[PDB]
């Protein structure tokens, strides 16, 4: 039940703190199903999010709780429901048990309200798990909020209302995978809890009581309260999150400033201005590009990298120990026995690497020296050492090196030697050496970004701002999302965001659209109308009118049916804008893109790259002791698994040898893989497979039991698998 805090970004850890599991005591609900339990029960209202469940294996056995949900006296999520005596609604609330909820006729919050007065005769209510159109006089109790219905993690989604509950799940789990960017911006459109999230989570640092600011360091803000006291507020400069994301508190208050009680002194890892901010709001066109955005691919403007927009700082913690072998202690020294000083530079400190040094894959992070054999020296190695320099330190190079994949610049190091202060060194462990390395991750083609709705996708091409879709005024789009990904999945919410986003871009303003009560299609067409004047109003005064292009796309647009035929281009474009789409020129050709295309400010986050992401490529490497199949670990990647499902694939094909190889030379043919390599090395057409050790392991396993398995010849006669080791003596 207790696990690593998942702090990819605060929101994440917060959720992981409140999540509920089955798999526990064993007494309550194990792995067998209990199918009915996994489904979202009727009572899960305001008590559990209906979205909050991991599509897949453990499917209904886990979930974080809801908004107003609270554990009363004994663990019974009581959900709040306000009272309504007669046709009068109250501001009083009753946290009710699941059971009692059924005895009453409860109504939803969407019911037109005048205050205490219900407004429509036939208004919806739901008795006990059954939708029922009740009358104002029967309405006993009413729902508290649209928010209490789901979880925090979910509540953060813009127009949840217009997105398929299935994909809205993805959206909620996506945020749990958000990585803190050095540049954190809040959404152009928010729901209303971003504030409360950063606040209730402990990202940003708030002011206890009113006063003024004394000093504003990059490491501390010692404020002076009006009470005649002043306290120093340290700020976790750069700390290592469990999942390796930067947690820094950037001061937002200047020197000598009267602070209100509870005002942001510094911003948390991902906050802009006390607002939750992950990923960044980017202008986006929503059309198809060549194939760069084909099933779920994203085309990104190079310009996004020019500015340090999607960029994130990562830290991995390489550690090595000085073990005590009976052959002789493993010394940690700048001494690396066999070949160069070039590799010893950054190993400045005798033994450890110098802070601030750029480490690439294959550089020594820390040196160490263990002994050569198990118990005896080497006869052949005896001659060689003698030939050029007998007196050769027989010690082995076992030094922590930069593992393939990446490193950055060393920022901190820790060494614990013999006389331990108040630390716990394991047995045999002579001493430990930690090396914190940090690195800037600028967005790249391998990466995956995804908005809060669920549109998930990978970058497939970084286009030069030179030729990507550009609006009439020279401002170009940052990302081009494929439309096709929208009909199938059903989350128009994103298309609703983009639109409000367009208004907020020219109107230079951010908004807050609540869960289901938020913005409405007419209110947005309204803001778009205001935006048209900032967009095109300046255009009017700046001195110019309409393009041949702008007129041309209008022609095809009326033939389409987006603009009322007969009205002036100026007026036609307004109409066209209000619809959420504007004219766009190619960028590569300068011609327009026949037909208006929507564009706008959509928030998009960048997702954390798992260890698997470090694409694993393995040539040759270690092998398990009892099973002779490839195995990795520390620095050798470890082989991919060839499953039955995959076998058949080959089997279906006429891939005879290719399947043989997969079963012999590549994984178990002990004598095979060896001659295999060597053959390749000499450019020899690889040798014909010897018997696999899985086979020999078997036969013997089989012999271990009375059974005798002997292979036979053309005529029933022996043949030999175990090459020459089974005949006796």
């Amino acid at each position: 039940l207790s696990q690593f805090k998942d702090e990819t970004n605060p929101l994440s850890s917060l959720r992981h703190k409140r999540r509920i599991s089955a798999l526990g005591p064993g007494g309550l609900t194990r792995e067998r199903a209990g199918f009915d339990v996994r489904d979202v029960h009727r009572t899960h209202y305001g008590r559990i999010c209906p979205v909050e469940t991991p599509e897949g294996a453990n499917i209904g056995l886990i979930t974080s709780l809801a908004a107003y949900a609270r554990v009363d006296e004994l663990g019974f999520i009581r959900t709040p429901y306000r009272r309504v005596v007669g046709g009068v609604v109250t501001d009083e609330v009753v946290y009710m048990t699941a059971t009692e909820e059924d005895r009453y006729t409860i109504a939803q919050a969407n019911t037109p309200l005048e205050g205490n007065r219900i407004a429509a005769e036939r208004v919806v209510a739901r008795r006990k798990g059954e939708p029922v159109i009740v009358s104002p006089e029967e309405v006993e109790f009413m729902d508290v909020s649209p928010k209490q219905v789901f979880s925090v993690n979910t509540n953060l989604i813009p127009f949840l209302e217009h997105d398929d509950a299935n994909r809205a799940l993805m959206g909620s789990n996506m945020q749990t995978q958000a990585v803190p960017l050095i540049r954190a911006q809040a959404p152009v459109v928010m729901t209303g809890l971003e504030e409360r999230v950063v606040r209730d989570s402990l990202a940003a640092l708030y002011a206890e009581e009113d006063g003024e600011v004394a000093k504003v360091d990059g490491n501390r803000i010692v404020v002076r309260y009006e009470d005649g006291r002043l306290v120093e507020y340290p700020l976790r400069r750069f700390y290592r999150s469990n999942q390796g994301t930067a947690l820094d508190q950037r001061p937002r208050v200047v020197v000598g400033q009267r602070v209100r009680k509870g005002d942001l002194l510094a911003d948390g890892p991902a906050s802009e201005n006390g607002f939750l901010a992950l990923g960044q709001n980017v202008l986006v066109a929503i059309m198809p590009f060549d194939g760069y955005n084909f099933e779920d691919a994203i085309v990104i403007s190079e310009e996004l990298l020019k500015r340090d927009f999607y960029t994130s700082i990562h830290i991995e913690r390489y550690e090595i120990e000085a073990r005590d072998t009976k052959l002789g202690p493993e010394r940690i020294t700048r001494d690396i026995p066999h070949l160069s000083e070039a590799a010893l530079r950054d190993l400045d400190e005798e033994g450890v690497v110098r802070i601030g040094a750029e480490v690439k894959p294959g550089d020594i992070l820390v040196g160490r020296t263990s002994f050569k054999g198990e118990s005896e020296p080497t006869p052949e190695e005896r001659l060689l050492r003698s030939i050029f320099g007998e007196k050769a330190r027989d010690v082995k190079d076992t030094s922590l090196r930069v593992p393939p994949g990446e490193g950055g610049i060393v920022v901190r190091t820790v060494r614990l030697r013999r006389g331990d202060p108040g630390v716990e060194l394991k047995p045999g462990v002579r001493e430990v050496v930690r090396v914190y390395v940090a690195q800037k991750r600028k967005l790249q083609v391998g990466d995956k970004l995804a908005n809060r709705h669920g549109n998930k996708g990978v970058v497939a091409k970084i286009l030069p701002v030179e030729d990507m879709p550009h609006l009439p005024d020279g401002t170009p789009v940052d990302v081009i999302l494929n439309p096709l990904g929208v009909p199938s999945r059903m989350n128009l919410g994103q298309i609703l965001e983009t639109h409000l986003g367009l208004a907020g871009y020219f109107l230079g303003q951010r908004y807050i659209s609540p869960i289901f009560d938020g913005a409405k299609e007419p209110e947005i067409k309204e803001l778009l109308a205001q935006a048209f004047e900032v967009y095109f109003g300046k255009r009017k005064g700046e001195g110019f009118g309409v393009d041949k292009r702008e007129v041309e796309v209008l022609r095809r647009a009326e033939k389409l049916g987006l603009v009322t035929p007969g009205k002036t281009p100026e007026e036609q474009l307004k109409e066209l804008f209000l619809q959420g789409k504007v004219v766009l020129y190619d960028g590569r050709t300068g011609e327009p893109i026949e037909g208006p295309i929507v564009v706008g400010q959509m928030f998009i986050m960048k997702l954390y790259h798992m260890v698997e992401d470090k694409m694993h490529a393995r040539s040759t490497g270690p092998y398990s002791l009892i099973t002779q199949q490839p195995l990795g670990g520390k620095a050798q990647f470890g082989g991919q698994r060839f499953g039955e499902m995959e076998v058949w694939a080959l089997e279906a094909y006429g891939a005879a040898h290719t399947l043989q190889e997969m079963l012999t030379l590549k994984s178990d043919d002990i004598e095979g893989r060896n001659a295999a390599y060597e053959a390749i090395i000499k450019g020899e057409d690889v040798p014909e497979p010897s018997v696999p050790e899985s086979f020999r392991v078997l036969v013997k396993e089989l012999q271990a039991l009375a059974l005798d398995v002997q292979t036979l010849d053309e005529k029933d006669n022996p043949v030999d698998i175990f090459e020459g080791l089974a005949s006796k003596r």
């Binding site: 118990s375 006869p379 002990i670 018997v691 020999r696 013997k700 089989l702 012999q703 039991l705 009375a706 059974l707 005798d708 398995v709 002997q710 292979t711 036979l712 010849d713 053309e714 029933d716 043949v719 698998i721 175990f722 090459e723 020459g724 080791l725 089974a726 006796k728 003596r729």
Partner: protein, 105 residues
Amino acid sequence: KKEVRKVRIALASPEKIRSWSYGEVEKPETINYRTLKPERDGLFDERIFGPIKDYECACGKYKRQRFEGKVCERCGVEVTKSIVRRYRMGHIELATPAAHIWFVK
């Protein structure tokens, strides 16, 4: 040399038990700490199952490939790598028989 074209499971004659085997494991002596070597005749003995080293013997009278198929005069070890150590079979001589549960149950 000849392609393996037929596999065959067949029951084990006690004489065939012994045929495959080398030596008799006669004592519960795994390995004795002081020397991580095989204790007495026990489960890991080098005569019974083989040399724990590449082409070399246990004592070292003969140490390279030239005589790859011969055994040492004072101690017994014919060599190819430690693989012979993982493929060879030893047998235990039961006092008064017992039976296979695979056939009885």
